Design a protein around this ligand. Sequence first.
Ligand SMILES: Cc1cc(N)nc(C)c1CNC(=O)c1cnn(Cc2ccc(Cn3cccn3)cc2)c1
Length: 239
Amino acid sequence: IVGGTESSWGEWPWQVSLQVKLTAQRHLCGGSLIGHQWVLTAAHCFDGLPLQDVWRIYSGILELSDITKDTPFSQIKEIIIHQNYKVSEGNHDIALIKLQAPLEYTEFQKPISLPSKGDTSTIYTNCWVTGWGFSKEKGEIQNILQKVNIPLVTNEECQKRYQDYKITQRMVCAGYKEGGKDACKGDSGGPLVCKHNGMWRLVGITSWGEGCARREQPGVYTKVAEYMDWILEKTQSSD
Ligand SMILES: Cc1cc(N)nc(C)c1CNC(=O)c1cnn(Cc2ccc(Cn3cccn3)cc2)c1
């Protein structure tokens, strides 16, 4: 997060950290808790070798430095990458993670509400992006979860700034004309939430930008509302 400030305990209880435990353990991506056993993140976080065995998912945490061998974590049971996602490309940058065990909700860890089907015409305001990613374009992972408020921009305007790519209706963009506030590397997969009718809603999944926080270069996010059919189908279960 570029241009943000430190979050407080329990402020963003759906924020998770996706880490890989190799010789050392490192935060790679964010994600959002959306159910007891389900996390929503970015597909491109998994572009490396297929090895869900090394991943550890941390919830209810504020500071990466607080993580030790004693910290509880979740493991991956299944990764569901969108069927039209292509490695290294931007379309359909969305993945579902099914956890091996369900999490119980507390004031420190609980789910973010998904967009409601009746809110297709909504123009979201008061949007926040959170994460432990870089605080500057050539920066480093941040210890305390950062937060920044960023306005949405129209897809027409976003497309204007990125005419080397196709900004589709399944993307949503956010940024300032003169930059200065943005998600960055290490924030990928985390939430873009906006308050609507006094409730937080997951509007975007942090995905990409050209550089970080540059003028007239908004952040590109996967538009969760445009994937609700897919989310519901992929998470469905009978009895
Ligand atoms: C680098 C960055 C800067 C920023 N302001 N904020 C974030 C969070 C990041 C981190 N993200 C990535 O390092 C990354 C790598 N791969 N991807 C998938 C992807 C998405 C989009 C395109 C271009 N595109 C636009 C429309 C269609 N395609 C290409 C790759 C993301």
